[PDB]
RNA sequence: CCGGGCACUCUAACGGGACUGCCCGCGAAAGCGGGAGGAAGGAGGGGACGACGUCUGGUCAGCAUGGCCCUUACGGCCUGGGCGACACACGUGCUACAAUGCCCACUACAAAGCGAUGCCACCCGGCAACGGGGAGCUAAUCGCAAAAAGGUGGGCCCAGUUCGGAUUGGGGUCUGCAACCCGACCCCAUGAAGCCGGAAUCGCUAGUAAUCGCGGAUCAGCCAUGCCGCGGUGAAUACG
């Protein structure tokens, strides 16, 4: 598992490679490269363990990512779902929370239609 | 394409300005 | 359509080979009105073609294309209770057409990864006579071959 | 939502009951209609009667709910499912 | 010496732009001659029918078309004698230096 | 001296001035070729002096403005031919065969009600 | 509901976002244009009659 | 599937449901009923049946009207029926010559 | 930019221009076929324009109007809710499934419109939305404004991906008395279905289709991917 807990697609570029972790997007991709100072563009083939560490101590310092992450979400919305809120209500029964119409759609919060 | 926010494609379809489409 | 047989669109002769030919050849590489695009994926692929085997560009393309007109073709004709696939000879306007667009048809069907290179290389094996092109043309003169029988149904 | 260079909404006429009940010692039930308001942190431990279109609903306040408007704990429509 | 020239109606406005050119071309000296200025045209486009029907629309339109004058040699002989001269209904006028 | 003509083609309208010399071309400020950069479709604007062999013989200078550079492209086509027979009287066959000398008046049609284009209508289900 | 509409959209309201324009001619909430102060089916009445100042039937 | 419209009516999830097993009838002809669709409506004379149901042989399109919604139900389905009949076999009338 | 000039472009008013007028041919004629001249040719392209009537078509909710019905209410004011619900089903659309593509950076070429508690240059704070300064423009002057596809370079390498951008978490902006239900926008993270679609079915005959962006009405803001316009690029095919 080597940074930060994934194991980063190889043959890619350090940038795109980094985005293959829970909680780091191709905008705190070019951030720690640049903190680090290393080539965006390598391969992480071609890193050194120099490198590798220097990325990922930066890495899983700085932001929360995979486990830890996921955890504060769901507790952020096991929250809402018990403090009763209308948002939660809508975690609680799986519909949209985000105002969408629902007569029609919502089939990623809904799933695939359900004949009657 | 369009449809993407973080993109200047998608902001120019959705004539809008930020970061990814600066002015 | 009802009243008259309609006009043939006289093309304009491309800039780099003074040919119609080639410009109708452009147009069905032209999606979404690119021409620009369609236009470097030909003469692209005229490059490749010249490298891959030293020939006129112009006489490979024009090779191909006498190789992918079908000169017989069958189409359907319901008589009684029965969809006979009467056999026809195609007319020059439309023997042209058909060879122009199988010739990028087949090319867009190939796995290798650029355009150009697809153009450049259906060109190659349909001048030498390979290539899913002249497999196009092939079968539909076999086809009307096959209903020798119904070419009385002529019209 | 709201810009945080204007204020922490909260109706006044709701408010000035809360610290009124605060002062005394709190509480008796308070109906309200103000829905856009925010809980805030005066109110926590409160009942507040929040109406939804119909019926006015007894919402307890606690230290979760804090940041919220009083609405999202009043729903206005009764959804049992279908069929 | 500005003279511009506004109406909804191209007829009486080209009479006006006529009259104010030569009224102060006759009492000297140079009136530069009427230019055109593009026309602003202001469209409505509504439904023919009260009630539904959304595929048939009527187009109007309300044109605003403008004319400039400059009299470039004024001498007040032109100047009083502007102050009286008869314009129609549909025309606006602006004057300015 | 000099010799002019007006093309256009759309919505693009082209000042054109032909003046003899080795065959340098200009557009707006820059050479052809740096404003028709990378289109095949401009070597086509230099096409009615090819008719009449006048290729080298003239520079140009050359006013574009309006619509796109193919429209632009052919407009300059129109005027340097209008310039030519300006130039020669006689210069008319051999330009007008070509249709050189004649301008397209096929332009953008109008947006209609009831369409989403000019003519593409709005898709309907009978049944 | 409709006079007491076409009245209580003249008085000022208690906010400034309350207020909309309503067609002065028959009261329309709806389609109502601004430069006009008439709904889009009296802008096409008055203009018909000729009773609306250098507007006039638009075809290109 | 199928569509019911009550036009200007309260009806009950019974009467839709009679409704399809009436619309049932057209199965018979072994073919693809695409969309069916139907319009329950009351004039001042009795009701009315509308339908519009394409197939790969064309389309049906009847109306049935009669004081009894039920008959008024019945005669757009005989209506309809016929209709599908010469769809699926006006082919077959000349297979000779 | 200045002198200067109005040539050219343009702008916008008025005219000229095409009538099968002219030659060949067929015609009883009307016309048709071909040619030349011409920017344009046989209605030059598009628009406005819709006969007697039909659908007991549509609209008493735009308006009017007969009659029937309501009168401390079937009238009127307000706060809140709802019109945005969601086992399902259909219609219209948007964005897509990628390499003729996607991403970054730099660099060109429109038209029609709109704009004084308006359009906003330019400056500065902020990754940004935006904010604070501040000039110009009763606007062919000033502003929205950058058009986008394109062009030039660089990255991606065929993977559910640097395709796709749904869903959700968190943080902010702006409008507005107020964004819980129920706003748009920005930023971080999340990164779904979708590998080109069954029966069936829609559009389009040329500057059309396709594709690309720009404007406007409504409008505090906006749920516009809608509508009405505008130009850019620009096909395929019609035996019958
Ligand atoms: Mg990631
Ligand atoms: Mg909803
Ligand atoms: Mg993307
Ligand atoms: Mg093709
Ligand atoms: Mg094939
Ligand atoms: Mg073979
Ligand atoms: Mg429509
Ligand atoms: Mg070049
Ligand atoms: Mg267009
Ligand atoms: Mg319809
Ligand atoms: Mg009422
Ligand atoms: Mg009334
Ligand atoms: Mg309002
Ligand atoms: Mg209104
Ligand atoms: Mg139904
Ligand atoms: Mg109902
Ligand atoms: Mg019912
Ligand atoms: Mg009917
Ligand atoms: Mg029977
Ligand atoms: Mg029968
Ligand atoms: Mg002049
Ligand atoms: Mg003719
Ligand atoms: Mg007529
Ligand atoms: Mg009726
Ligand atoms: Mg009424
Ligand atoms: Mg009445
Ligand atoms: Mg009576
Ligand atoms: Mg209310
Ligand atoms: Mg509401
Ligand atoms: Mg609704
Ligand atoms: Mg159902
Ligand atoms: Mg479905
Ligand atoms: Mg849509
Ligand atoms: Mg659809
Ligand atoms: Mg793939
Ligand atoms: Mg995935
Ligand atoms: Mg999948
Ligand atoms: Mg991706
Ligand atoms: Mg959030
Ligand atoms: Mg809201
Ligand atoms: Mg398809
Ligand atoms: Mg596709
Ligand atoms: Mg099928
Ligand atoms: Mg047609
Ligand atoms: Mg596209
Ligand atoms: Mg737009
Ligand atoms: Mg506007
Ligand atoms: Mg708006
Ligand atoms: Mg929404
Ligand atoms: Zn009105």
Redesign the interface.
């Known amino acids: 598992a080597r940074i930060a807990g994934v194991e980063i697609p190889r043959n890619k570029r350090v940038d795109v490679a980094l985005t293959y972790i829970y909680g780091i997007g191709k905008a705190r991709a070019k951030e720690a490269l640049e903190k680090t100072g290393i080539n965006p563009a390598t391969r992480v083939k071609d890193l050194t363990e120099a490198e590798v560490v220097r990325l990922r101590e930066y890495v899983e310092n700085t932001w929360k990512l995979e486990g830890e992450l996921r955890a504060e979400v769901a507790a952020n919305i096991k929250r809402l779902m018990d403090i009763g809120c209308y948002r939660g209500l809508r975690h609680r029964r799986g519909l949209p929370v985000r105002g969408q119409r629902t007569r029609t759609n919502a089939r990623t919060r809904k799933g695939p239609r359900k004949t009657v | 394409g369009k449809g993407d926010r973080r993109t200047r494609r998608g902001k120019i379809w959705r004539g809008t300005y930020g970061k990814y489409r600066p002015r | 359509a009802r009243r008259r047989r309609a006009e043939v669109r006289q093309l304009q002769p491309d800039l780099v080979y003074g040919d119609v030919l080639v410009t109708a050849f452009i147009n069905k590489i032209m999606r979404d009105g690119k021409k620009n695009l369609a236009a470097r994926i030909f003469y692209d692929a005229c490059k490749i073609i010249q490298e891959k085997t030293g020939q006129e560009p112009l006489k490979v393309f024009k090779q191909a294309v006498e190789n992918v007109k079908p000169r017989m073709e069958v189409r359907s004709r319901r008589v009684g209770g029965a969809n006979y696939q009467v056999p026809m000879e195609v007319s020059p306007r439309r023997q042209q057409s058909l060879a122009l667009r199988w010739l990028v048809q087949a090319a867009n069907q190939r796995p290798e990864r650029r355009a150009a290179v697809r153009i450049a290389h259906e060109l190659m094996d349909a001048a030498e006579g390979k290539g899913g092109a002249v497999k196009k043309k092939e079968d539909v003169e076999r086809m009307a071959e096959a209903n020798r029988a119904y070419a009385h149904y002529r019209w | 939502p709201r810009s945080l260079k204007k204020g922490v909404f909260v109706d006044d006429h709701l408010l000035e009951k809360v610290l009124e009940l605060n002062a005394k010692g709190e509480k008796r039930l308070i109906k309200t209609w103000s829905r856009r308001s925010t809980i805030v942190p005066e109110m926590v431990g409160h009942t507040i009667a929040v109406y939804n279109g119909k019926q006015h609903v007894p919402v307890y306040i606690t230290e979760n709910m804090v940041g919220h408007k009083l609405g999202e704990f009043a729903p206005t429509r009764t959804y049992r499912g279908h069929g | 010496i500005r003279i511009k020239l506004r109406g909804f109606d191209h007829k009486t406005l080209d009479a006006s732009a006529q009259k104010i050119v030569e009224a102060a071309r006759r009492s000297g000296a140079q009136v530069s001659g009427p230019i055109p200025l593009p026309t602003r045209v202001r469209r409505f486009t509504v439904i023919r029918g009260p009630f539904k029907h959304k595929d048939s629309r009527e187009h109007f339109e309300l044109r605003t078309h403008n004319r400039l004058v400059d009299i470039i040699n004024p001498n007040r002989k032109t100047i009083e004698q502007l102050m009286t001269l008869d314009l129609p209904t549909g025309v606006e006028i602006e004057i300015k230096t | 001296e000099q010799y002019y003509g007006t093309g256009r083609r759309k919505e693009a309208v082209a000042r054109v001035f032909l003046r003899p010399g080795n065959g340098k071309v200009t557009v707006n400020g820059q050479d052809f070729n740096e404003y028709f950069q990378g289109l095949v479709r401009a070597v086509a604007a230099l096409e009615p002096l090819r008719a009449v062999d006048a290729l080298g013989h003239f520079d140009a200078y050359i006013t574009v403005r309006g619509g796109g550079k193919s429209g632009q492209i052919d407009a300059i086509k129109l005027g340097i031919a209008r310039a030519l027979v300006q130039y020669n009287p006689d210069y008319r066959a051999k330009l007008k065969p070509l249709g050189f000398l004649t301008r397209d008046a096929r332009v953008v049609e109008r947006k209609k009600y009831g369409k989403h284009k000019a003519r593409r209508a709005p898709q309907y289900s009978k049944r | 509901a409709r006079k007491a509409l076409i009245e209580k959209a003249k008085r000022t309201p208690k906010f400034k976002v309350r207020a909309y324009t309503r067609c002065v001619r028959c009261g329309r909430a709806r389609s109502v244009y601004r430069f006009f102060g008439l709904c889009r089916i009296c802008l096409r009445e008055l203009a018909h009659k000729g009773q609306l100042p250098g507007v006039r039937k638009a075809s290109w | 599937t199928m569509n019911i419209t009550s036009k200007q009516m309260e009806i009950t999830p019974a009467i839709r449901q009679h409704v399809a097993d009436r619309l049932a009838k057209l199965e018979k002809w072994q073919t693809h009923l695409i969309?069916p669709?139907i319009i329950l409506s009351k004039e001042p004379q009795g009701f009315v049946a509308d339908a519009?149901?394409?197939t790969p042989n064309g389309?049906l399109?009847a109306s049935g009207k009669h004081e009894d919604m039920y008959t008024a139900i019945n005669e757009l389905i005989n209506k309809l029926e016929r209709q599908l009949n010469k769809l699926q076999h006006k082919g077959?009338a000349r297979?000779?010559?």
């Open positions: 969309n669709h519009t149901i394409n389309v399109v077959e297979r000779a010559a």
